[PDB]
DNA sequence: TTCAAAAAGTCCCA
DNA sequence: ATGGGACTTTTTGA
């Protein structure tokens, strides 16, 4: 339930919010952590504040009450007026209170609240806010609390949104005018469709000073999440430019230097600036060379995949072990071949073509009644009946216990089409010739009838598999973990395509590559040469 | 009725 | 034991 932020990052965030504070002008700053936990951030804040007060004690004594401002009174003052924490875990709050007391008679009152930060009536705003909020996705969040969030945090929380969206909104709302906030959250809201409303909220309510994007680097040990650090303020500024620090090597160990600033200035990161006013609903955080590249491609292409194609997600059985069998399984002798479909996984998809399938799907929707094919139900599917009965559509009666949860439309699959994995390190679009079915880890599309004369499957896999389109898609794609991007229709269908004088030769090269890849003695080397030639053709076409 | 999004991923090994 | 690499289910809101 508790996650420890590495000390280097905590130090960076506290220094980011407090390094230029004018303690003489305002000796009563309110610093808040609304998910403080054991006190990772607040103890460092206490250290920084103590040094800040102690270095200016005599100036404070001369400008204000000379009896109040003594070194012996610093500790008490810090706990009374400066440090605020909130967390829902009682034990963490008790431990933090003990630590803050032990940093150094009457008892000082420590501003630590044990509550739900999203429900607390906050009585005042704050000068500085730091911390690491909790991340809960749509599956792991309780439905009652989700009803609450959808009612009260609708500006950022809808559909498949995350709890830390609400923490972002809460932080922004309780930040004093001129205040500074700095947090570490998952990076996914920067590009995801669920994060659109949250991105709009941030852009329209704060000045984003700085974004540190670690991409697929493993910041939290033994945790599968990809992180970023956001720093924003509510200052009166007429410029609103963002400093973006994007990591270049995801294999880096984070403790190579003493400070995170040394790492950011180093050759391990790239830095660039983004105009906050030029942000659309999407945040395209790239350097000027990449921006030029992306804009050239966008302007030159007249069509998008959405215009010319029909997209769809694969089968969602709701229990794969009940419906998927190895093609050499003896139990398939009980199933009529009219009920069997070819089944592939994301790993069976290469550039341009699909591996031969090793699995079969029982399309159980076509089973009329339980008495005609009783053997299939009793001996194959029924072995998981309990689990099958706990699916949502079974509990509500919309679906029989032996039916596929989301069987889609068969006719969408039993046709020539293009398939691609839902998560990959590179563009892998293939032409499926074999009426392959797949789960939701594989997405498919086919070309609309009215665009068949303008675009062929061979040409499309030719350009989509090129290095140009690999880089082009990765510009705006959703970076998930190390060497993994989401390849989902909400972005894949936005890919723009072109049609010009190089169409015929690109198509010929694609057909040659496909012909070689379907041979017995594959000579992959000539495939690589042909791909290089096609990439040259594409770069000529797009004017890069 | 029925779409598609969602990594505090998941699991294994050296 | 940890860190790194291969690979990806079904719950869920709309
Ligand atoms: N199902 C569900 C039901 C209710 C909630 C309440 C959300 N409200 C919260 N308010 C304040 N602190 C919170 C918190 N949730 C977690 N935290 C702390 O955050 C830190 C993580 O690093 C931990 O120290 C954790 O305790 C969440 C999920
Ligand atoms: K004085
Ligand atoms: K990671």
DSSP A282-325: S-----HHHHHHHHHHHHH--EEHHHHEEEEE--B-S-HHHHEE
Distance of alpha carbon A418 from alpha carbon A441, whole angstroms: 14
Q: Which two tokens stand for residue A241?
A: 């430019």
Residues A384 and A490 in one domain: yes
**Does A198 reside within a domain?**
yes
For residues A344 and A442, the answer to whether their CB atoms sit within 8 Å is: yes
Give long-range contacts, CB 8 A cutoff, 24+ apart: A400-406.
A402/A364, A402/A367, A402/A370, A402/A377, A403/A364, A403/A365, A404/A315, A404/A316, A404/A317, A404/A318, A404/A323, A404/A363, A404/A364, A404/A365, A405/A316, A405/A317, A405/A318, A406/A315, A406/A316, A406/A317, A406/A318
> Strand pairing partners for A419?
A430, A444
The length of chain A in residues reads: 544
Distance of alpha carbon A460 from alpha carbon A447, whole angstroms: 10
Residues A326 and A257 in one domain: no
Residues whose CB is less than 8 angstroms from the CB of residue A118 and which lie 6 or more positions away in sequence, other chains included = A149, A152, A153, A166, A167, A170
Measuring CA to CA, which residue among A140, A223, A247, A242 is closest to residue A479?
Answer: A247
**Does A372 reside within a domain?**
yes
Residue with tokens 């053997």: A375
Residues A71 and A212 in one domain: no
Which protein residue has its CA closest to C1' of B9?
A: A224
* Integer Rg of chain A from CA: 29
Measuring CA to CA, which residue among A459, A446, A395, A456 is closest to residue A419?
Answer: A446
Determined by which method?
X-ray
Separation of CA A447 from chain center: 29
End position of a domain, from candidates A79, A103, A132: A132
Pocket of ligand 1, beta carbon within 6 A: A 1-3, 35, 37, 86-89, 92, 116-118, 132, 134, 136, 141-142, 145
Residue with tokens 């992306």: A294
Q: Which two tokens stand for residue A521?
A: 């003695």
Residues A185 and A238 in one domain: yes
For residues A462 and A541, the answer to whether their CB atoms sit within 8 Å is: no
Which nucleotide shows the minimum CA-to-C1' distance to residue A162?
Answer: B6
The neighbour count for residue A365, using CB atoms within 10 Å, is 15
Q: What is the dihedral of CA A252, A258, A259, A261, to 10 degrees?
A: -70
CA distances from A162 to A68, A115, A141, A229 (A): 46, 20, 9, 17
Measuring CA to CA, which residue among A205, A191, A199 is closest to residue A156?
Answer: A199
Distance of alpha carbon A184 from alpha carbon A17, whole angstroms: 13
Distance of alpha carbon A413 from alpha carbon A438, whole angstroms: 9
**DSSP code of residue A381:** I
CA distances from A305 to A232, A284, A444 (A): 36, 20, 12
**Does A165 reside within a domain?**
no
Spacing of A223 CA from B10 C1' in Å: 11
Which nucleotide shows the minimum CA-to-C1' distance to residue A423?
Answer: C8
Measuring CA to CA, which residue among A44, A37, A35 is closest to residue A17?
Answer: A44
Spacing of A59 CA from B6 C1' in Å: 54
Residues A429 and A513 in one domain: yes
Which nucleotide shows the minimum CA-to-C1' distance to residue A154?
Answer: C13
The neighbour count for residue A356, using CB atoms within 10 Å, is 11
Segment (H or E) for A542: helix A524-542
Distance of alpha carbon A339 from alpha carbon A360, whole angstroms: 10
Helix, coil or strand: residue A437 = strand
Helix, coil or strand: residue A354 = strand
Residues A322 and A239 in one domain: no
Distance of alpha carbon A353 from alpha carbon A516, whole angstroms: 11
CA distances from A254 to A6, A12, A135, A218 (A): 9, 13, 22, 9
End position of a domain, from candidates A77, A100, A132: A132
CATH number of the CATH domain containing A253? 3.40.50.150
For residues A311 and A445, the answer to whether their CB atoms sit within 8 Å is: yes
Measuring CA to CA, which residue among A236, A184, A180, A214 is closest to residue A19?
Answer: A180
Asked whether residue A146's C-beta has any atom of DNA/RNA strand C within 7 A, the reply is: yes
Distance of alpha carbon A274 from alpha carbon A278, whole angstroms: 8
**Does A492 reside within a domain?**
yes
Strand C contact nucleotides, protein CB < 7 Å:
2-14
> Strand pairing partners for A436?
none
Atom of ligand 1 nearest to the CA of A118: 8
Separation of CA A263 from chain center: 23
For residues A128 and A180, the answer to whether their CB atoms sit within 8 Å is: yes
Residues A276 and A338 in one domain: no
**Does A468 reside within a domain?**
yes
Residues A77 and A187 in one domain: no
CA angle (A96 as vertex; A95, A102 as ends), nearest 5: 90
Residues A257 and A355 in one domain: no
Dihedral sign from CA coordinates of A381, A383, A386, A391: negative
For residues A57 and A69, the answer to whether their CB atoms sit within 8 Å is: yes
Distance of alpha carbon A498 from alpha carbon A150, whole angstroms: 41
Measuring CA to CA, which residue among A139, A250, A156, A163 is closest to residue A205?
Answer: A156
Residues A126 and A40 in one domain: yes
End position of a domain, from candidates A132, A162, A190: A132
Measuring CA to CA, which residue among A211, A246, A201 is closest to residue A232?
Answer: A211
Measuring CA to CA, which residue among A250, A261, A188 is closest to residue A219?
Answer: A250
Q: Which two tokens stand for residue A368?
A: 């009329």
**Does A258 reside within a domain?**
yes
Q: What is the dihedral of CA A17, A19, A20, A25, to 10 degrees?
A: 90
Q: Could you tell me whether strands A31-33 and A126-131 are parallel, antiparallel, or unpaired per DSSP bridges? A: parallel
CA distances from A538 to A81, A477, A504, A543 (A): 63, 21, 12, 9
Note down the domain range covering A95.
Answer: 1-132
Tally of structural domains, chain A: 3
Counting Cα atoms < 13 Å in the Cβ hemisphere of A421 gives 21
Q: Which two tokens stand for residue A367?
A: 């089973």
A400: CA distance to ligand 1 center in Å? 38
Q: Could you tell me whether strands A207-213 and A241-247 are parallel, antiparallel, or unpaired per DSSP bridges? A: parallel
Distance of alpha carbon A401 from alpha carbon A397, whole angstroms: 9
Measuring CA to CA, which residue among A317, A350, A344, A342 is closest to residue A424?
Answer: A350
Distance of alpha carbon A291 from alpha carbon A284, whole angstroms: 8
Q: Which two tokens stand for residue A522?
A: 């594959």
Residue with tokens 């403790």: A255
Dihedral sign from CA coordinates of A260, A263, A269, A273: positive
Residues A277 and A319 in one domain: no
Burial of A421 (0-12, 13-18, 19+ CB in 10 A): buried
Distance of alpha carbon A513 from alpha carbon A531, whole angstroms: 8
Distance of alpha carbon A246 from alpha carbon A264, whole angstroms: 9
**Does A150 reside within a domain?**
no
Residues whose CB is less than 8 angstroms from the CB of residue A310 and which lie 6 or more positions away in sequence, other chains included = A412, A445, A446, A447, A448
Residues A375 and A407 in one domain: yes
Strand B contact nucleotides, protein CB < 7 Å:
1-11
Residue with tokens 């590559």: A513
For residues A45 and A83, the answer to whether their CB atoms sit within 8 Å is: yes
Give helix then strand counts, H and E, for chain A.
Answer: 21, 22
**Does A450 reside within a domain?**
yes
């Amino acid at each position: 339930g508790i996650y420890y932020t590495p000390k280097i990052i905590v130090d960076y965030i506290v220094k980011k919010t407090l390094k230029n504070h004018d303690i003489i002008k305002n000796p009563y700053p309110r610093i808040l952590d609304i998910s403080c936990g054991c006190g990772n951030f607040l103890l460092e804040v206490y250290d920084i504040l103590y040094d800040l007060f102690e270095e200016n004690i005599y100036e404070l004594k001369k400008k204000y009450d000379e009896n109040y401002w003594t070194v012996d009174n610093i500790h008490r003052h810090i706990l009374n007026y400066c440090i605020y924490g909130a967390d829902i875990d009682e034990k963490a709050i008790s431990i933090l209170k003990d630590s803050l007391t032990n940093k150094k008679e009457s008892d000082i009152k420590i501003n630590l609240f044990c509550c739900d930060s999203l429900k607390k009536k906050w009585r005042y705003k704050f000068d500085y806010i730091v911390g690491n909020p909790p991340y809960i996705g749509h599956k792991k969040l309780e439905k009652k609390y989700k009803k609450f969030l959808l009612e009260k945090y609708s500006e950022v929380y809808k559909d498949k949104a995350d709890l830390y969206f609400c923490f972002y909104k809460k932080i922004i709302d309780i930040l004093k005018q001129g205040g500074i906030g700095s947090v570490i959250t998952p990076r996914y809201f920067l590009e995801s469709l669920s994060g659109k409303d949250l991105r709009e909220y941030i852009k329209s309510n704060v000045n984003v000073q700085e974004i540190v994007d670690f991409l697929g680097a493993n910041i939290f040990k033994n945790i599968g999440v990809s992180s970023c650090i956001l720093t924003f303020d509510k200052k009166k500024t007429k410029e609103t430019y963002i400093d973006v620090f994007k990591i270049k090597n995801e294999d880096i160990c984070i403790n190579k230097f003493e400070t995170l600033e040394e790492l950011l200035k180093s050759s391990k990161f790239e830095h660039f600036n983004i105009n906050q006013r030029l942000l659309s609903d999407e945040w395209i955080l790239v350097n000027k060379d990449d921006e030029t590249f992306y804009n050239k491609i966008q302007e030159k292409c007249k069509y998008s995949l959405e215009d010319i194609a029909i997209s769809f997600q694969g089968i969602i059985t709701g229990c794969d072990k009940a419906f998927i069998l190895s093609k050499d399984d003896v139990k398939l002798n009980l199933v009529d071949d009219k009920f069997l479909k070819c089944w592939i996984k994301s790993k069976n998809i290469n550039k341009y073509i699909v591996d031969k399938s090793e699995y079969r799907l029982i399309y159980s929707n076509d089973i009329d009644n339980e008495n005609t094919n009783k053997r299939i139900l009793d001996e194959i599917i029924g072995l998981y009946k309990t689990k099958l009965e706990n699916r949502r559509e079974c509990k509500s009666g919309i679906r029989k216990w032996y039916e596929l949860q989301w069987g889609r439309e068969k006719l969408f699959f039993e046709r020539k089409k293009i398939m691609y994995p839902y998560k990959s390190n590179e563009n892998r679009f293939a032409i499926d010739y074999d009426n392959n079915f797949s789960s939701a880890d594989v997405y498919s599309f086919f070309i609309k009838e009215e665009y068949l004369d303008k675009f062929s499957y061979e040409y499309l896999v030719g350009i989509l598999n090129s290095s140009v389109y690999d880089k082009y898609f990765k510009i705006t794609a959703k970076k998930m973990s190390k060497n993994i991007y989401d390849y989902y229709p909400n972005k894949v269908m936005k890919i723009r395509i072109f049609r010009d004088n190089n169409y015929e030769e690109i198509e010929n090269l694609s057909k040659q590559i496909i012909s070689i890849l379907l041979n017995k003695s594959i000579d992959k080397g000539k495939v690589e040469k042909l791909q290089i030639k096609m990439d040259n053709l594409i770069m000529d076409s797009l004017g890069i």
